[PDB]
Design an enzyme around this catalytic site. Structure first.
Site, PDB file in Angstrom:
ATOM      1  N   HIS A   6      57.522 -35.670  43.419  1.00 51.54           N
ATOM      2  CA  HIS A   6      58.227 -35.264  42.211  1.00 51.54           C
ATOM      3  C   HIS A   6      59.640 -34.769  42.424  1.00 51.54           C
ATOM      4  O   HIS A   6      60.411 -34.762  41.479  1.00 51.54           O
ATOM      5  CB  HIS A   6      57.415 -34.282  41.353  1.00 51.54           C
ATOM      6  CG  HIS A   6      57.423 -32.873  41.844  1.00 51.54           C
ATOM      7  ND1 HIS A   6      56.438 -32.365  42.663  1.00 51.54           N
ATOM      8  CD2 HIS A   6      58.287 -31.857  41.619  1.00 51.54           C
ATOM      9  CE1 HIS A   6      56.693 -31.098  42.922  1.00 51.54           C
ATOM     10  NE2 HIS A   6      57.811 -30.765  42.301  1.00 51.54           N
ATOM     11  N   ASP A  56      51.278 -36.631  44.830  1.00 53.21           N
ATOM     12  CA  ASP A  56      52.611 -36.049  44.916  1.00 53.21           C
ATOM     13  C   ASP A  56      53.017 -35.993  46.359  1.00 53.21           C
ATOM     14  O   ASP A  56      52.857 -34.965  47.020  1.00 53.21           O
ATOM     15  CB  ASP A  56      52.619 -34.635  44.349  1.00 53.21           C
ATOM     16  CG  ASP A  56      53.994 -34.206  43.861  1.00 53.21           C
ATOM     17  OD1 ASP A  56      55.032 -34.577  44.455  1.00 53.21           O
ATOM     18  OD2 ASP A  56      54.046 -33.479  42.852  1.00 53.21           O
ATOM     19  N   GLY A  63      61.646 -24.373  42.890  1.00 53.91           N
ATOM     20  CA  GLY A  63      62.620 -24.597  43.949  1.00 53.91           C
ATOM     21  C   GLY A  63      61.993 -24.684  45.338  1.00 53.91           C
ATOM     22  O   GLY A  63      62.691 -25.004  46.320  1.00 53.91           O
ATOM     23  N   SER A 100      59.093 -26.493  45.698  1.00 53.85           N
ATOM     24  CA  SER A 100      58.457 -27.812  45.655  1.00 53.85           C
ATOM     25  C   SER A 100      58.857 -28.641  46.842  1.00 53.85           C
ATOM     26  O   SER A 100      60.039 -28.753  47.130  1.00 53.85           O
ATOM     27  CB  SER A 100      58.883 -28.572  44.401  1.00 53.85           C
ATOM     28  OG  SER A 100      58.133 -28.182  43.261  1.00 53.85           O
ATOM     29  N   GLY A 101      57.873 -29.235  47.510  1.00 52.72           N
ATOM     30  CA  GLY A 101      58.138 -30.052  48.683  1.00 52.72           C
ATOM     31  C   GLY A 101      57.990 -29.295  49.989  1.00 52.72           C
ATOM     32  O   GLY A 101      57.747 -29.897  51.010  1.00 52.72           O
TER      33      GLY A 101
HETATM   34  C1  LIG Z   1      58.793 -27.089  42.585  1.00 56.69           C
HETATM   35  O1  LIG Z   1      59.290 -25.893  43.134  1.00 56.69           O
HETATM   36  C2  LIG Z   1      57.929 -26.641  41.415  1.00 56.69           C
HETATM   37  C3  LIG Z   1      56.865 -25.562  41.606  1.00 56.69           C
HETATM   38  C4  LIG Z   1      55.893 -25.738  42.576  1.00 56.69           C
HETATM   39  C5  LIG Z   1      54.912 -24.769  42.765  1.00 56.69           C
HETATM   40  C6  LIG Z   1      54.811 -23.564  42.016  1.00 56.69           C
HETATM   41  C7  LIG Z   1      53.756 -22.654  42.310  1.00 56.69           C
HETATM   42  N1  LIG Z   1      53.593 -21.513  41.649  1.00 56.69           N
HETATM   43  N2  LIG Z   1      52.868 -22.897  43.258  1.00 56.69           N
HETATM   44  C8  LIG Z   1      55.807 -23.360  41.008  1.00 56.69           C
HETATM   45  C9  LIG Z   1      56.766 -24.374  40.872  1.00 56.69           C
HETATM   46  C10 LIG Z   1      59.999 -27.858  41.928  1.00 56.69           C
HETATM   47  O2  LIG Z   1      59.742 -28.950  41.428  1.00 56.69           O
HETATM   48  O3  LIG Z   1      61.163 -27.148  42.046  1.00 56.69           O
END
Ligand SMILES: *[C@](O)(Cc1ccc(C(=N)N)cc1)C(=O)O
Ligand SMILES: *[C@](O)(Cc1ccc(C(=N)N)cc1)C(=O)O
Ligand SMILES: *[C@](O)(Cc1ccc(C(=N)N)cc1)C(=O)O
Ligand SMILES: *[C@](O)(Cc1ccc(C(=N)N)cc1)C(=O)O
Lengths: 244, 244, 244, 244
Positions: free
Chosen positions: D44, D91, D192, D194-195
């Site tokens: 994503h 993902d 932020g 994510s990944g």
């Molecule tokens: C990712 O940071 C989105 C994201 C992932 C995970 C969580 C969480 N509480 N485990 C919140 C947000 C992005 O796409 O920036």
């Protein structure tokens, strides 16, 4: 308007909304109809930088901001030659409507005060407008015209209150003689009300004491709203606005 | 700082960044070290309202904004007494450090100008700070200190330019005598540079002509940058700041 | 509603607006009256998380969003059990009103299509709502009800388009069988129209083909609007909604 | 990283920051070095809509987000074909660096868990990233790399909570089999992150258990963070990334 209530459908027939050409003619200030062809407003709503009249349009009194618009074009904008900033005073301006309006019970002019009125404390004055209901609290739709009863305050007492909590020496005058204070911590005009009227009922006749000008926040302690003293610019106004 | 370039690691040893206790001590204005224990800055950064010294903290010169902070508390804040608004003038204030600073090559004071120096057009002058790199364009991390070279303007031409496009009559001085101008359409200070130093090389030496005060935006045509003319407040500065 | 026009004051009687209790009862999704006591709308407007009924409110068909609000409370909220995400499908829900409405020429139910219909490409369909008129361009006041005519698109063609410019394998289905496509680069529904209706004039009769569900933006190339296919959830709708 | 502290200058050599060419190369996601020439990250972050490699760039492990950048370009981006939505699954994506790095004590690869490894409830797992420190509370400069120790949670227990307070039927599976849960109300990854990697120490070695994927808010009650199951996509990872 901080505090107050929604003005009754037939209360301030002189109120006018100054609109700009946005995505939609968005209300940016208020003003009052003082003559069937002239509108009195705060200069800071249209200056000190020159505005293109096409971008401007006037909406006469209406109970709910956008529901029944009928925008009137302006023919000429006249801002006071001494106006630069509201804190420096002279924040006043006239907008000449392209064509005279047809006065009625719902839309008719306000009376300017005589050059002998001082509007002392105790006077029943009101501020009206469609501006914020509190600090950073915009007016929720359906945008009803609000009114509030505010208390006049001696310039001298006011000027002083403005120094409380400030580095500014007392020998330095913050509240100019051409300005007029009014309001308390729960009753005040606010952002978006600028250019609107402060009218007092003197001897049964609604008179326009001042024009919403500036201030340090909405309804803040020791910071009453500042309005332009209409009586101080009576002559200048008459240079353009005929008598009747 | 509109225009300009990142400044050499050893160029403006007097530069300081004033910080407020937010979520973090984020920068909000600049300053200049004029004595191992005092910081010169614009009053509008810390006034006219009284500020909590604990809520303030000074950061000495550094190349990148928040990498290696070493915050110093401020002992006293002294805002000029005639200060109320930047347009009105007297936009100058002093900050006494709780403790002196150990001066060096990378961090030492700036020489105030002699009461005679007028900094006429033609002088090589620079402005320094960590502010917006254009209107609403905030300085991107790593927040390098940028410097820009600005052309000085004579107050009467500066005042004249300011009246262009403005309804404000010419008999109304917009640019006061305790103010100085510098800048053009592609070079000027901007938001966040306030309180910063405009320094010029006068006879092989860097003197501080002005303190970044106001302006009508950033790098806009006919609205050059207004800075507080330091020589004007030279006396006052000295009333608090000892010689050497 | 991107593209299109302001709808006739007597055009979409089944339209309803869902309101969240905020600073004011703000509209967050459209919805349709399919029975004098039942409102059909998208599950995402009220799920997957359980909402409190005291905060939700239904307003019947009105030409201008906040002028003459007459809020009706909701008795029950019945989201579809297989629902968690719009992309995953099953984006549909029912709202039981507290009391039955008095149907008239201005406010009356929309006809649910027979389980047999498909609404093939070429169907004269319309979407109506009070949403954005473009991405990030909210509906300017006085919030008129808008309507736009959109072309139905065959699923298999629509799924292909959704793959153009994406990494997702062709074998993977983006556009499910319980979804319907309609719109183009100039006509489409938008943020805020969610939960509203897509009705088609089938053999002289207005049938609700779908419910505004999801999309990758408003009016974007190769990304037509996805609507929940109603025929698909007919039997489900009927387990709560009496026939006539 | 909601909760946690600033990671030691030598704790996560496999950490990387993904950058999009903005006004500046801003960090938009984290990733991990799983081989000297490949970076693993959540799909994503770079899909499903095709991205231009000229706008993406990988920054290797760095203690403070923008201070000493050394951006590396990508040669190829491989998004798992089943991906379209996080809630839907798969993902996972791989970025191939244009050139292999020179691994060292501070910057080297992490070990991928063997097909067998399960990661039982209570595992000493850690999440690391430069994301928000709380819902809508961005990581303030100097952008330290943060870490937090979160407890693993069984899919069946985690899925159970994703139904608590939700209309979605218990028969509907929210937390898919290719996902993994970890965290709690005071320790969780966030916007932020994510990944980024979810590594667990298993028998003396740091194995990458999961990849930050989704969740309904940061550190939210009954909404533990969902991660992509690495063991699950091992075969695929290896279809591109050689073993050693
Ligand atoms: C990712 O940071 C989105 C994201 C992932 C995970 C969580 C969480 N509480 N485990 C919140 C947000 C992005 O796409 O920036
Ligand atoms: C004016 O509304 C600005 C304005 C005027 C008055 C006060 C006050 N507290 N009396 C605050 C703000 C505008 O220009 O929008
Ligand atoms: C000051 O930076 C505000 C400021 C200063 C200077 C200029 C300019 N055009 N020279 C614009 C604005 C602050 O208060 O942050
Ligand atoms: C819905 O309005 C979201 C939504 C629905 C439809 C489209 C479209 N382009 N057809 C965009 C967005 C909401 O959740 O407010």
């Amino acid at each position: 308007i901080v505090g107050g209530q929604e003005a009754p459908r037939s209360k301030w027939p002189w109120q006018v909304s100054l609109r700009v050409h946005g995505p939609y003619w968005m209300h940016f200030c208020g003003g009052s109809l003082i003559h069937p062809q002239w509108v009195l407003t705060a200069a800071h709503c249209v200056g000190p930088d020159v505005k293109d009249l096409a971008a401007l349009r006037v909406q006469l009194r209406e109970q709910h901001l956008y529901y029944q618009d009928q925008l009137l074009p302006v023919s000429r904008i006249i801002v006071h030659p001494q106006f630069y900033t509201a804190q420096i005073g002279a924040d006043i301006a006239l907008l000449e409507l392209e064509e005279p309006v047809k006065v009625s019970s719902h839309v008719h002019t306000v009376t300017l005060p005589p050059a002998s009125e001082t509007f002392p404390p105790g006077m029943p004055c009101w501020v009206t407008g469609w501006g914020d209901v509190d600090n950073d609290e915009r007016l929720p739709p359906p945008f009803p015209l609000k009114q509030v009863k505010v208390p006049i305050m001696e310039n001298h007492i006011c000027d002083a209150k403005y120094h409380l909590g400030a580095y500014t020496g007392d020998d330095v005058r913050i509240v100019r003689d051409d300005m007029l204070c009014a309001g308390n911590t729960r009753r005040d005009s606010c952002q978006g009300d600028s250019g609107g009227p402060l009218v007092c009922k003197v001897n049964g006749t609604w008179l326009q004491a001042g024009v919403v000008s500036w201030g340090e926040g909405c309804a803040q302690p020791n910071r009453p709203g500042i309005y332009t003293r209409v009586t101080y610019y009576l002559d200048w106004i008459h240079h353009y606005v005929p008598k009747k």
